[PDB]
């Protein structure tokens, strides 16, 4: 995917980067720019279940990170968010492509994990 | 060992004030020498205008105009052959462009109205204009320098002098590349800082990126040179190319009198871009952007009558120049100077507790923050050191803070425990290791609306932001002594120190004592190396962000080839000491090999510590060629001088301020000034602003209070010039000051001493350092 | 909008409607710091610890207590309209669009007491920009 | 201070056509700082456009 010339001969070094919102200080406090939610479905059931989280997280926003549900079949579908977007103060402006503080988007990723349960226990 | 020049490292600074001594200044040569000389005049000023253009009028002059006049009758206007000979007996074409000298009489006590016509040519070009600082070089013979050359009839000196202005050329500023570099500590620097990552050196690309192959980036230097001697004073300019259509560059001038002392002048303090539309917001780094400013290699023949020839070249005796922005308070002394930064270059960290500390040897950082009153709100208002100052000034009490005995001990230890400390290991909470800060903090512009923690410790001094501004949270955001300065401190406040009998006697207020270490300056007989620390003892030695005349890589005692203390300034006050430093330099100078070496698309600070070793292929980076002293400041210097100012917080006292004795923030105006300065007995038609009828009609005790609280109004250096905030619906703000900066740094207000003659019961100090610009004079 | 309009000549600095929305206020802290006499039985006086604000002259005490009712601050930086922070751009157009938000949080100016002004020449109602 | 501007040339030829140019396209502030940013009015800014007018005299050989 990369050759090793790009770092040998300095093509394009890689820069520093700074903390996004950075006046939020300590590790503690930081925990709440993290955007987290869960939610379990069965084969039992088909009723859709939200993946609905907190920004900033413990006024706040709901979050709709997305939404799953399972079929009788076992197929679980994952659905992403609707697209919203926004930041705590509507004049904070997302002028940068890719850093912009105050912001948080409904964008996740994470763990899919499962149970099986056959009639003979 | 024969010959060497001082000072080592010269300074002179731009201004749009003419290269001629009469309307010049100079450097100091002797620390403290002028603090409260309130004749000071650092604009040139009408009269100086008026009497140079007597003296040009000295006859010949005058019966060689009564001989054209004898040519005017018996025609009965003026001629252009006339015209440019009346110049050039007058010699002002070198002040001013010759056709408008000629068009001044054309359109025209015949002697009246030709002075009264150029006379409105000098004063439109130079009144009330920044006049240049100038540094003088001398040779001093050795043998350890003894005295200053002395030129027999016969002898001669050959002045040489190269210089360059790489910014265009260098990398951007984002901050010191040293935050990150692994040391031991030294006196400038805590290894705290790299050790325990507070301010973490980040990565800076090229400036002028578009520019691409070395051989194509060779046009973005400036350089030039010359030479003088002493059997010619006749100034001759510096002046390079940018690109090298084309813009002509004057770097700076240099002459040479008589006797063999050089002058040099820096540049006319001109910043452009390649194109009008080419704006300078940014702090440091804006490309198709360049300045006059330079700095470059010093060095001289010396040629007998005898026929004996002495070559000034290599680094031990040869010297440098730095030209920088105007000082807008000379007066006012920074508190952590650069010749501190030389001092504590040599200086390793953990080997501190064997420093030795003279009252003297505290006494500046007192005496410097005391003195920011004048150049800064908080020192005035909001300072709690100088508050206690003032009470022990108030009942002549000041000399117990000499006092190094038990009984004063609780008394040094309070002023001690109020200051930051530059192990930056005090008002934080670790993390898990990270540092944060429990004090308060100063926030980026970039806001989230999430409340802030509340700061537990309170804010220690000074209150100026530092090195790590960039990092919310960092205990480096704000600034400290460095921890040789610290050192002395924790040593006066445990009793740890030495002083003389006759400085406890000198000591009843913080202003006695400093006329006295003043006049112990002035009657040091070490004339060259009180030259060599008065050079650098009015720069700024930190914060560097970048700094306002030079940055971090002096902090460092690899940029020296030779750092050494000599002695104390007095045979019994140290008064910080004088060393004998000389800098690093590439004998080869303009044609060294790596006059244009860079580090790739980047430079980091793993570029630093590659060159810590003498011979890596990054060492060249201490060995330094003209230009390099300056290429790592802002790019025009003006972007970076209007950045140089507030920093505000959240909680609105004490207003944090980067540099304010230099640049200052908060002055006191001409405009105030006239409203304070009279007494109520003075018998003119108007005392203080007011009527005489006002005036002498109130109570003694209302007049007094009216000229205090004028006294108490200062107002923002920002707003001695109009930077952008003048007009209906004007947007003022801080890219229009950047902006607006490059043509108006000629008009912002120049701090001068000034008397109060007799200021009553009033509480006004008999000397004030007031403001002068043409917004503020009324 | 409603705040200074700046010549080229520093002083007077023209204001539009000052009486209701103040421009050049005298905030809670200097209050804080001449409302005392140098009697007062407070550990604290004019932000002085105890023995300082005793040690020096009356003179130099009441001198103290007028430079800092001398001290007035810009309404405009009362509340956070986009200069605070490091390299803030401030300016007259973030002030408007940060009052939308920040009106609420500007200082409130009220009457408030100097119960011994002695010598100082501060009244005995003085009137106080409270904010955060 | 103060900027020449080339408004045009003119110049004549020996049948009498008298031929008009115009100036070089040059437009600047008064100040480099000084951006013109209204598609119409912008303070502080010339340019080299011009309207005048134009006359003659003809002279004969009879005088
Ligand atoms: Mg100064």
């Not at chain 2, 940055?551 to 000599?566: A, C, E, F, G, K």
């Not at chain 2, 793993?606 to 990054?618: R, Y």
């Amino acid at each position: 995917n990369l050759s090793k010339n790009v770092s040998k001969h300095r093509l394009a070094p890689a820069m520093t980067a700074k903390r996004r919102n950075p006046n939020v200080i300590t590790n503690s406090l930081r925990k709440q720019l993290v955007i987290s939610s869960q939610g379990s479905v069965s084969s039992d059931n088909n009723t859709q279940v939200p993946l609905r989280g907190k920004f900033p997280a413990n006024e706040r926003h709901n979050v709709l990170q997305g939404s799953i549900e399972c079929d009788n079949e076992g197929v679980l579908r994952f659905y992403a968010g609707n697209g919203i977007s926004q930041a705590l103060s509507p004049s904070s402006l997302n002028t940068d492509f890719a850093d912009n503080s105050n912001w948080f988007d409904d964008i996740c990723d994470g763990r899919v994990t499962a149970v099986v349960e056959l009639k003979n226990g | 060992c024969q010959y060497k020049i001082y000072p080592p490292l010269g300074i002179a600074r731009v201004g749009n004030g003419p290269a001629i001594k009469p309307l010049s200044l100079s450097t100091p040569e002797v620390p403290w020498a002028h603090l409260y000389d309130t004749n000071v005049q650092y604009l040139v000023t009408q009269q100086e205008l008026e009497q140079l253009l007597e003296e040009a009028f000295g006859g010949n002059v005058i019966n060689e105009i009564s001989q054209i006049k004898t040519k005017l009758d018996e025609r009965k206007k003026f001629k252009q052959e006339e015209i440019e000979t009346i110049t050039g007996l007058l010699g002002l074409s070198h002040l001013v462009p010759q056709q408008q000298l000629s068009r001044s009489l054309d359109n025209l006590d015949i002697v009246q109205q030709i002075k009264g016509a150029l006379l409105k040519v000098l004063s439109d070009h130079y009144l009330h204009a920044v006049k240049k600082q100038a540094q003088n070089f001398y040779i001093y013979k050795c043998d350890n320098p003894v005295e200053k050359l002395k030129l027999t009839d016969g002898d001669k000196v050959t002045w040489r002098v190269e210089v360059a202005n790489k910014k265009s050329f260098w990398y951007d500023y984002n901050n010191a590349l040293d935050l990150s570099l692994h040391t031991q500590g030294s006196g400038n620097l805590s290894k705290n800082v790299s050790k325990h990552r507070l301010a973490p050196a980040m990565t800076a690309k090229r400036r002028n990126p578009n520019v691409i192959t070395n051989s194509l980036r060779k046009q973005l230097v400036i350089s030039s040179q010359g030479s003088v001697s002493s059997d010619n004073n006749t100034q001759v300019p510096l002046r390079g190319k940018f690109p090298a259509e084309r813009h002509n560059v004057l770097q700076g001038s240099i002459e040479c009198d008589n006797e063999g002392v050089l002058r040099f002048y820096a540049g006319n303090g001109i910043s452009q871009a390649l194109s009008p539309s080419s704006l300078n917001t940014d702090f440091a780094d804006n490309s198709n952007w360049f300045d006059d400013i330079c700095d470059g290699r010093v060095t001289a023949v010396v040629e007998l009558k005898n026929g004996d020839t002495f070559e000034i070249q290599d680094e031990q005796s040869s010297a440098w120049v730095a030209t920088t922005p105007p000082d807008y308070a000379p007066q006012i002394e920074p508190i952590v100077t650069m010749y501190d930064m030389v001092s504590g270059a040599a200086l390793k960290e953990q080997d501190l507790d064997n420093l030795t500390t003279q009252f003297s040897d505290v006494f500046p950082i007192l005496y410097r923050l005391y003195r920011m009153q004048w150049v800064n709100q908080a020192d005035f208002t909001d300072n709690a050191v100088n508050t206690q100052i003032r009470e022990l000034n108030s009942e002549l009490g000041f000399a117990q803070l000499l006092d190094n005995s038990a009984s004063a001990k609780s008394l040094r230890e309070g002023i001690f425990n109020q200051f930051r400390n530059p192990l930056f290991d005090q008002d934080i909470d670790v993390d898990d290791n990270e540092w944060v800060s429990n004090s308060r903090i100063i926030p980026s512009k970039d806001e989230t609306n999430i409340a802030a923690k509340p700061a537990t410790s309170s804010l220690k001094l000074p209150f100026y932001p530092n090195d790590g501004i960039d990092y919310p949270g960092s205990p480096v955001q704000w600034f400290a002594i460095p921890p040789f300065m610290y050192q002395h401190l924790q040593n006066w406040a445990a009793g740890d120190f030495s002083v003389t009998q006759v400085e406890k006697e000198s000591a009843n207020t913080i202003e006695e004592l400093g006329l006295f270490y003043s006049e112990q300056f002035k009657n040091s007989p070490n004339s060259a190396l009180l030259c060599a620390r008065g050079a650098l003892d009015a720069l700024y030695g930190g914060g560097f962000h970048p700094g306002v005349e030079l940055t971090w890589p002096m902090r460092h005692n690899l940029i020296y080839s030779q750092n050494d203390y000599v002695s104390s300034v007095t045979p019994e006050i140290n008064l910080l000491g004088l060393r004998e430093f000389r800098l690093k330099q590439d004998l080869q100078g303009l044609n060294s090999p790596n006059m244009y070496q860079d580090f790739g698309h980047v430079i980091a600070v793993d570029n630093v510590t590659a060159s810590i070793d003498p011979n890596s292929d990054a060492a060249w980076l201490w060995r330094s060629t003209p230009g390099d002293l300056t290429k790592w400041m802002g790019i025009p210097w003006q972007s970076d001088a209007a950045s140089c100012q507030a920093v505000y917080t959240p909680e609105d006292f004490p207003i944090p301020s980067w540099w304010a004795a230099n640049l200052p923030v908060h002055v006191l105006p001409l405009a105030r000034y006239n409203k304070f300065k009279d007494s109520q007995s003075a018998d003119l038609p108007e005392i203080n602003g007011m009527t005489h009828s006002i005036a002498q009609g109130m109570s003694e005790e209302t007049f007094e209070h009216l000229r205090l609280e004028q006294f108490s109004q200062r107002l923002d250096w920002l707003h001695t010039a109009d930077l952008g905030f003048v007009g209906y619906a004007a947007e003022g703000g801080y890219t229009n000051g950047l902006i607006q900066m490059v043509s108006q740094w000629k008009n912002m207000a120049m701090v001068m001493a000034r008397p109060v003659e007799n200021p009553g019961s009033s509480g006004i100090p008999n000397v004030v350092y007031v403001a002068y610009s043409q917004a503020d004079k009324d």
